[PDB]
Ligand binder design. Structure first.
Ligand SMILES: CCCCCCCCCCCCCCCCCC(=O)OC[C@H](COP(=O)([O-])OCC(O)COP(=O)([O-])OC[C@@H](COC(=O)CCCCCCCCCCCCCCCCC)OC(=O)CCCCCCCCCCCCCCCCC)OC(=O)CCCCCCCCCCCCCCCCC
Ligand code: BCL
Ligand SMILES: C/C=C1/c2cc3[nH]c4c(c3C)C(=O)[C@H](C(=O)OC)c4c3nc(cc4[nH]c(cc(n2)[C@@H]1C)c(C(C)=O)c4C)[C@@H](C)[C@@H]3CCC(=O)OC/C=C(\C)CCC[C@H](C)CCC[C@H](C)CCCC(C)C
Ligand SMILES: C/C=C1/c2cc3[nH]c4c(c3C)C(=O)[C@H](C(=O)OC)c4c3nc(cc4[nH]c(cc(n2)[C@@H]1C)c(C(C)=O)c4C)[C@@H](C)[C@@H]3CCC(=O)OC/C=C(\C)CCC[C@H](C)CCC[C@H](C)CCCC(C)C
Ligand SMILES: CCCCCCCCCCCCCCCCCC(=O)OC[C@H](COP(=O)([O-])OCC[N+](C)(C)C)OC(=O)CCCCCCCCCCCCCCCCC
Ligand SMILES: CCCCCCCCCCCCCCCCCC(=O)OC[C@H](COP(=O)([O-])OCC[N+](C)(C)C)OC(=O)CCCCCCCCCCCCCCCCC
Ligand SMILES: CCCCCCCCCCCCCCCCCC(=O)OC[C@H](COP(=O)([O-])OCC[N+](C)(C)C)OC(=O)CCCCCCCCCCCCCCCCC
Ligand SMILES: COC(C)(C)C/C=C/C(C)=C/C=C/C(C)=C/C=C/C(C)=C/C=C/C=C(C)/C=C/C=C(\C)CC/C=C(\C)CCC=C(C)C
Ligand SMILES: COC(C)(C)C/C=C/C(C)=C/C=C/C(C)=C/C=C/C(C)=C/C=C/C=C(C)/C=C/C=C(\C)CC/C=C(\C)CCC=C(C)C
Ligand SMILES: COC(C)(C)C/C=C/C(C)=C/C=C/C(C)=C/C=C/C(C)=C/C=C\C=C(C)\C=C\C=C(/C)CC/C=C(\C)CCC=C(C)C
Ligand SMILES: COC(C)(C)C/C=C/C(C)=C/C=C/C(C)=C/C=C/C(C)=C\C=C\C=C(C)\C=C\C=C(/C)CC/C=C(\C)CCC=C(C)C
Ligand SMILES: [Fe+2]
Lengths: 260, 44, 54, 305, 281, 54, 43, 54, 38, 54, 54, 54, 44, 43
């Protein structure tokens, strides 16, 4: 079949390439349609629906049947965020920042934001709790690397705000998730591991300073952690990067601020 | 009433009738064009 | 043929009409390009021959 | 800054035997050792592996394929261990010569062994595909892995089975050997004009580059939002959190559109599948329909003349 | 305008240069100082490619080509019509890519996430600079860089590869190709696994990460985990690009011959270099 | 042949009809291109020869 | 059998209208085939 | 042969019928392409030969 | 499925199968008469 | 040979029948392709040579 | 040799029989292909040369 | 040599027997192919030369 | 030392080393019992 | 860890011995088999 044409130069090479162009257009449409299942419809900065919705229409809803009798999530659906946002718009026109009205970290807006998830712990496959302190877990032990239990915890201002008591691990996943860090208030806070730098003599936290360690949202029950409060803790620890920038003893930051 | 799209019988008939009116209008224009081309230069 | 209308209790009109419009335009472009490719029925070249444009 | 590239402290405890729905555990083996080296990057547990009917079929066929090629390599070195050591990358199990065509009458020593090894490889690969499908089915999961593997198998079949049949010769399949199959690739390109001017070859390269692109993008995004528990993706699909929102907003403010925790994986699977899909189509058209791609490109507005 | 959830994140700050001069959005796009710069550079580059189309004489998008200066011009400038437009477009492209990376830093930073994404984009930028800047400067002329054409830079790839015979025998090349193939395999497997967990057999409950580990341990016997798979993806892609840059930086610079001649050293190693038989000897 | 209708208690009409439409269009395009490929039954070339166009 | 959701009467009605459409399509195909065969046979 | 019907207490009809349809179409395409490949039984070339068309 | 359902479904299947087979036999005879392969 | 039936207290009929069908079809395709490959027993060429179709 | 039967108190029959069937089929295909490869014992070519098929 | 039996208080019989079967088959295949490779002891060619098949 | 792992490694080692030694012998034109036997008994 | 050290040591010792024997076998001299064949007229 080498080289006969149906018309002009059109052969199976050309038929295949044009068929692929059509198929690719259809596939791109389908992929974007699947990706329009969270966050839509679009809205103005004042909450009312926008005149924009886009060239791509919303897909038909599909239902996820949650495991462990948690119910059903059907998407796309009506999305509200079931919490008040403490922001005030800077300009009357659109596409401008909304400045925080009170304390930004702690009303939970910006990089310190959090989401109202279900106030329940996520479960492993067998139904138990997924994340658990070392003492509550049976058989787990620090297996390699510098064991952080018993070390002081230093903030971004080169003060020590507490010291490590226990590790929260993720049972099926077999990896450490939180540092239970206890202050000389006596109450304990949770530290995401990916926000802490475990050194030989010291657990450094670039995010926060000592005075902000007390503000971390504490845990409802003392052996478990729910999704809501994980957002709450993670959002505050992470928003500490911008909102605790002044209080930080960084050579390069002081360098640039003195020049600026 | 299968309800797959949610439309009822009367809605279905109305929509199909207006569709078919459009379809036959399109077909008539196509037939006029085809006759014009055929008279201008036949392909049979 | 009388009750073909029940196809609309099977198919959502919006999706069908979008697909139909895309299909019809693509078919029309197909046939026009096929006609333009052949030395005859390439009405452009033919009118160039008839009125001695070249 | 901790970059989350390597775990800085590890933990372990009881091994996880895995979920137990519709799975015959008589066939699942026992958990193996824990690797401290693998634990610095991901999970440290090895095993347990499921050993079923298709598992034994695939293991037998693949082991015999590998063994057949190895025995031919040993013969081809004169049974000398030092020559085998030094010419390991230069040995080759080459298909029958063109004059045999598609016939199975090629003597044992210019391609009977190639045919035997190819039969073993066929059985091994198709058994593994069936095993992928059944392992997905046993746990009540979708069959997406089976279809992506089917795309890879499509390219493999075109290279070794379908195109030789269309060209009417076993001589045009791929030899078993490192440098020999690289030379087969280069000579395939030389014989048919540039494959660079094969449009489906270009599409395949586009989707391979896109795979590297998209998967660097996605790994970087998930590692950047892992501070909010972003790596736990099934739960973010189930119950959207701030990691998902921050990822979506990063990509929306960067390039004007974003995805979902769910939908980026549809992008990923299609981006990876299209590589071998368009590659198989291009190789099938190569030689059967076009035998000089540069001239074809000249004829199709691709090359200057 | 805004996603249902976007407004609580649109806050001031987290930007490297210019305070709140350009700390605003245009539609969904965040602008910033480096967004202004990258729009300028991208616009100018696309315009200059169109002007190349005008000068060359074609309007076929697949035939437009912007060639670098010829070899005799060395590392100096060339007339715009015969090599200078390529140089200006290269400067515009480099500026656009770098500004894009810095704008990504600013966005990562307003959102409070890590900088893995501008990290990984810097690897691609360095591979591009290796092909366009480092190797031709180390090697003497702008004429060793590739033209800006859809099908004419493939000609550059082919000619450069065949200058050294079968380029398949470059060893860093083989490592890079293995990384690319492994990356595509891992991407397919990961997308399939997550989709199959989120979309199970049809009407039965949504799966868990335990099911993913169980499936893959049944398949081959060692699951890597979610964090593991994302780490492995980032590292596979970055290693592929790094070894590409290496294999091309050493080519024509410390290696000048056929690459199978490089592979020749293992064959000639003392305790087998003389034995008869086999492929070699 | 009388109870073939129970195929619709096996198959969902929507999916079957979409697949059938795609299949029928693809088959029609197949056969038309096969006819256009052969020097005979390429009705374009044949009519051009008959009326002496070029 | 209980696999899609339709009853007996619905199945018969849908199948009857399908088959009417199928035979209409078949009739148009037969007319076209006879026209082509008369114009130029392939046997 | 009388009680072959019990195969349907082994196999789900839906899956079997989908597989059977795919198999039958693929086999038919197989055989048609095999016939088209050989210089004889390539009915296209043959009718061309018989009626002296090209 | 039960016994009666199985028999009913198998009977209608086999009617369809023999209809398909009959059309195939007619086509095969037509081709064989037109041009034999034996 | 009389009590070979006890194989069905060892093996589930569904899995065995699926495997058997796949095996039988693959073997048949094997043998047909082997016959088609050889210049003799490639019945296509035989039928072409016997009736002077070339 | 009398009490070889205790192998079945060691091995599960199902797994052993699946492995044995796979092994036997693979060995048979091995030997048949080896015979077909050699110019003699390739019964096909032998038959072709015996009846003067060419 | 009398108490070699205590190896079975070291090794699980199932795993050992599977490994032993695989090893023995692979070794037998090894030796048979080695014999077939040499011009002598390739019993096929030797019979072919004895009975003059070529 | 686990006796099972040690025994498996020892068995693999012993067998692999024996195969290597036999291959070294078969490589040399001499010591190739099959081939020298063929020379002796006029198998050419 | 004594186990890992012992395994690495055993692998090292065996591999090094094989390399040395191969180096000897490479040279036309010191190839005990081949010089023995020359001595005893094995050609
Ligand atoms: C009407 C007018 C006429 C118009 C005509 C023109 C039409 C234009 C259309 C434009 C395109 C529109 C969009 C297309 C993409 C849509 C994707 C989609 O909708 O996903 C939904 C759906 C999502 O499933 P889900 O919701 O996640 O599952 C949830 C369930 O609970 C769990 O469900 P599950 O676990 O059971 O999953 C089952 C399902 C879900 O699959 C997945 O999970 C995703 C896997 C993605 C990879 C799939 C590719 C595998 C490639 C197989 C072999 C490749 C080589 C084939 C040969 C190449 C062609 C020559 O599996 C599949 O669908 C894949 C089957 C692959 C068989 C391919 C056989 C050969 C091709 C035959 C064509 C028909 C194919 C089937 C069509 C019907 C499907 C129901 O996924 C799919 O159905 C995949 C669609 C497959 C499309 C065809 C695949 C090959 C395409 C070939 C392109 C060639 C172009 C021409 C070039 C050369 C020409 C000469
Ligand atoms: C001089 C050489 C030629 C050329 C000749 C070819 C040829 C010839 C081919 C390609 C193909 C490809 N080439 Mg090219 N290529 C050239 C230049 C390039 C350049 C470049 C920058 O120069 C790039 C990026 C590429 C890139 C690509 C890929 C997009 C594509 C292969 C996809 C793939 O992953 O296959 C790898 C994946 C597979 C082969 C699938 C394997 C699946 C099976 C199931 C695996 C079984 C494993 C087996 C059982 C082993 C088990 C092991 C144990 C389990 C451990 N080529 C030049 C022009 N290239 C292919 C293609 O599709 O082209 C259209 C192809 O055939
Ligand atoms: C989308 C396109 C991509 C893609 C896709 C996918 N690829 C998959 C899957 C998907 C989705 C699977 O589900 C499946 C799997 O289970 O993964 C863990 C599989 C596999 N891809 C393998 C190899 C491979 N993929 C390559 C390429 C791409 N793949 C491209 C880029 C390349 C090259 C050359 O680039 C190679 C070598 C094996 C690891 C494995 C099959 C094992 C087998 O068949 O064993 C059967 C063979 C044996 C058991 C022989 C063993 C020999 C002795 C015992 C030692
Ligand atoms: C592991 C490393 C991988 C990797 C990594 C990442 N890659 C990233 C990111 C990461 C992580 C991002 O975050 C970033 C991004 O946001 O993505 C959406 C980006 C992007 N990856 C692009 C393309 C791309 N990635 C490739 C390769 C890999 N990427 C490798 C494998 C390849 C090829 C050929 O292989 C291509 C074409 C763009 C889509 C985008 C930059 C847009 C830009 O910079 O816009 C700014 C520039 C413009 C809008 C236009 C400028 C036009 C100039 C002036 C005229 C140019 C003409 C041209 C010189 C010649 C034509 C011939
Ligand atoms: C090869 C081409 C393949 C197909 C490409 C299809 C997309 C082409 C590019 C479209 C981009 C913008 C689409 C939306 C839009 O324009 O809305 C604006 C405005 C406002 O639309 P809107 O943003 O307010 O949205 C309306 C409400 N929704 C979202 C729900 C639809 O549209 C109009 O009022 C009238 C549109 C006039 C026609 C389009 C104008 C030009 C668009 C092309 C880009 C700029 C011109 C470039 C010319 C040079 C050649 C490239
Ligand atoms: C799977 C295959 C993907 C691989 C790539 C295939 C090649 C085609 C490019 C597409 C790349 C992926 C994007 C697909 C979907 C994009 C999209 O949804 O846009 C919506 C978005 C709109 O944002 P949005 O989607 O968030 O809007 C919300 C409302 N909805 C969802 C309803 C629309 O478009 C953008 O904002 C960014 C533009 C994306 C396209 C940019 C591609 C640039 C390519 C330049 C090539 C020009 C040709 C040069 C040729 C020579 C010179 C002439
Ligand atoms: C406030 C401070 C004020 C200080 C003022 C005093 C500074 C005095 C500076 C005088 C000369 C400076 C020399 C610069 C170093 C050049 C290296 C050199 O040795 O030159 C030899 C070569 C001579 O090339 P040649 O080919 O003619 O000769 C070969 C060189 N020999 C034989 C001598 C070994 O010149 C170059 O390398 C030219 C490089 C051009 C660099 C321009 C880059 C533009 C910026 C954007 C870069 C990013 C995009 C890259 C794209 C580039 C365009 C495509
Ligand atoms: C290369 O190979 C070549 C090309 C040479 C040879 C190729 C050969 C191949 C094998 C040819 C294959 C042919 C196939 C098998 C033919 C199949 C034909 C039939 C199955 C197609 C069916 C057509 C019927 C269509 C037109 C139905 C039309 C009906 C619609 C108008 C509406 C009816 C739909 C519903 C039921 C109506 C209302 C809905 C409810 C609510 C009542
Ligand atoms: C290269 O090799 C070559 C090509 C040369 C040779 C190849 C040879 C191969 C081996 C050929 C293989 C042939 C195969 C084995 C033939 C198989 C034929 C049979 C099995 C196909 C069956 C056809 C029957 C079909 C048409 C059924 C039709 C029935 C439908 C119309 C509806 C019936 C479905 C249900 C039961 C009806 C509803 C019932 C209710 C109660 C729900
Ligand atoms: C000392 O070590 C020992 C000897 C014990 C074992 C070591 C062995 C080592 C040396 C093995 C080396 C293996 C080589 C290096 C593997 C290379 C594989 C190459 C790279 C594969 C590349 C391409 C091969 C693919 C394309 C093959 C595709 C063929 C499939 C489509 C199946 C073909 C279908 C056949 C032709 C059907 C024939 C059916 C029967 C009737 C013959
Ligand atoms: C390339 O190098 C060449 C090929 C030239 C030379 C190669 C030489 C190599 C080193 C040869 C290696 C030979 C090996 C070491 C021989 C080992 C033989 C023995 C260990 C195999 C054992 C066979 C016993 C089998 C048959 C057991 C049969 C018992 C079953 C029937 C049932 C009993 C199982 C349980 C207890 C019953 C309940
Ligand atoms: Fe992911």
């Amino acid at each position: 079949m080498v080289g006969v044409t149906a018309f002009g130069n059109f052969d199976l090479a050309s038929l295949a390439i044009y068929s692929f162009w059509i198929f690719l257009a259809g596939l791109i449409y389908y992929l974007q349609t699947e990706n329009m299942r969270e966050g839509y419809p679009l809205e103005n900065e004042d909450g009312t629906p926008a005149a924009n919705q886009g060239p791509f229409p919303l897909p038909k809803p599909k239902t996820f049947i949650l495991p462990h009798g948690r119910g059903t999530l059907t998407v796309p659906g009506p999305e509200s965020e079931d919490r008040p946002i403490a922001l005030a718009r800077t300009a009357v026109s659109e596409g401008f920042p909304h400045a925080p009205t009170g304390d930004p970290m702690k009303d939970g807006v910006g990089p310190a934001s959090w989401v109202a998830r279900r106030d329940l712990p996520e479960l492993d496959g067998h139904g138990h709790n997924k994340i658990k302190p070392m003492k509550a877990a049976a058989g787990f032990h620090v297996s390699a690397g510098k064991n952080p239990i018993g070390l002081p915890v230093r903030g971004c201002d080169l003060e020590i705000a507490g010291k490590v008591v226990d590790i929260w691990v993720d049972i099926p996943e077999q990896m450490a998730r939180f540092l239970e860090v206890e202050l000389k208030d006596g109450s304990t806070r949770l530290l995401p591991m990916q926000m802490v730098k475990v050194q030989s003599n010291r657990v450094h936290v670039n995010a926060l300073s000592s005075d902000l360690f007390a503000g971390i949202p504490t845990i409802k029950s003392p052996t478990e952690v729910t999704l809501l409060e994980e957002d709450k803790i993670c959002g505050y620890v992470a928003g500490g990067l911008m909102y605790a920038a002044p209080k930080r003893k960084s050579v390069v930051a002081a360098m640039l601020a003195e020049y600026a | 009433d299968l309800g797959y799209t949610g439309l009822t019988d009367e809605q279905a008939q109305e929509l199909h009738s207006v569709y078919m009116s459009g379809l036959w209008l399109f077909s008539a224009v196509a037939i006029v064009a085809h006759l014009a081309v055929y008279i201008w230069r036949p392909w049979f | 043929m009388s009750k073909f209308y029940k196809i609309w209790m099977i198919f959502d009109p919006r999706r069908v009409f979008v697909a139909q419009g895309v299909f019809l335009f693509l078919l029309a472009v197909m046939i026009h390009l096929i006609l333009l490719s052949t030395p005859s029925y390439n009405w452009l070249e033919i009118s160039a021959a008839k009125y001695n444009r070249v | 800054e901790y970059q989350n590239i390597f775990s800085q402290v590890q933990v372990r405890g009881p091994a996880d035997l895995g979920m137990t729905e519709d799975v015959n555990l008589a066939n699942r083996s026992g958990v193996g050792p824990f690797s401290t080296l693998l634990g610095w990057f991901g999970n440290a547990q090895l095993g347990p592996i499921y050993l079923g009917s298709l598992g034994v079929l695939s293991l037998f066929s693949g082991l015999m394929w590998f063994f057949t090629i190895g025995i031919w390599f040993w013969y081809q070195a004169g049974w000398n261990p030092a020559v085998f050591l030094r010419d390991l990358f230069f040995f080759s199990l080459e298909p029958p010569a063109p004059e045999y065509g598609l016939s199975f009458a090629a003597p044992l020593k210019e391609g009977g062994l190639w045919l035997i090894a190819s039969f073993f490889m066929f059985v091994a690969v198709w058994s593994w595909w069936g095993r992928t499908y059944l392992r997905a089915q046993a746990l009540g999961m979708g069959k997406h892995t089976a279809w992506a593997f089917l795309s890879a198998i499509w390219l493999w079949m075109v290279l070794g089975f379908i195109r030789p049949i269309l060209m009417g010769s076993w001589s045009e399949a791929v030899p078993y050997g490192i440098f020999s199959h690289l030379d087969w690739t280069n000579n395939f390109s030389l014989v048919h004009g540039n494959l660079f001017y094969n449009p489906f070859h270009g599409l395949s390269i586009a989707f391979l580059y896109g795979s590297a692109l998209l998967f660097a993008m996605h790994g970087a995004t998930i590692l950047a939002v892992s501070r909010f528990g972003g790596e736990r993706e099934l739960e973010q699909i189930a119950d959207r959190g701030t990691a998902a929102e921050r990822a979506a907003l990063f990509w929306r403010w960067t390039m004007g559109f974003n995805a979902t925790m769910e939908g980026i994986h549809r992008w990923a699977i299609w981006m990876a599948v299209l590589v071998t899909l368009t590659g198989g189509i291009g190789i099938l058209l190569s030689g059967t329909v076009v035998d000089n791609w540069y001239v074809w490109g000249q004829n199709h507005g691709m090359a200057p003349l | 305008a805004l996603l249902s959830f976007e407004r609580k994140y649109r806050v001031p700050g987290g930007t490297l240069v210019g305070g709140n001069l350009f700390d605003f959005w245009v539609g969904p796009f965040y602008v910033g100082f480096f967004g202004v710069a990258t729009f300028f550079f991208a616009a100018l580059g696309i315009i200059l490619i169109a002007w190349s189309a005008v000068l060359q004489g074609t309007w076929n998008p697949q035939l437009i080509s912007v060639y670098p200066p010829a070899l005799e011009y060395g590392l100096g400038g060339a007339p715009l019509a015969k090599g200078g437009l390529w140089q200006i477009i290269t400067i515009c492209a480099t500026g656009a890519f770098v500004s894009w990376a810095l704008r990504e830093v600013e966005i990562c930073r307003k959102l409070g996430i890590g900088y893995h994404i501008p990290f990984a984009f810097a690897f691609a930028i360095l591979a591009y600079l290796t092909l366009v800047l480092f190797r031709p400067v180390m090697m003497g002329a702008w004429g060793y860089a590739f033209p800006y054409g859809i099908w004419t830079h493939l000609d550059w790839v082919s000619n450069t590869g065949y200058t050294y015979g079968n380029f398949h025998y470059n060893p860093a090349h083989m490592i890079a190709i293995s990384f690319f193939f492994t990356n595509a395999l891992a991407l397919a497997l990961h997308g399939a696994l997550v989709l199959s967990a989120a979309n199970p057999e049809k009407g039965k409950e949504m799966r868990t990460p335990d099911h993913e580990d169980t499936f893959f341990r049944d398949l081959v016997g060692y699951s890597i985990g979610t964090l593991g798979i994302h780490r492995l993806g980032l590292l596979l892609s970055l290693s592929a690009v790094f070894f590409s840059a290496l294999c091309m930086i050493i080519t024509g610079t410390i290696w000048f011959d056929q690459w199978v001649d490089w592979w020749q050293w293992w064959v000639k190693l003392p305790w087998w270099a003389n034995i008869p038989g086999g492929i070699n000897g």
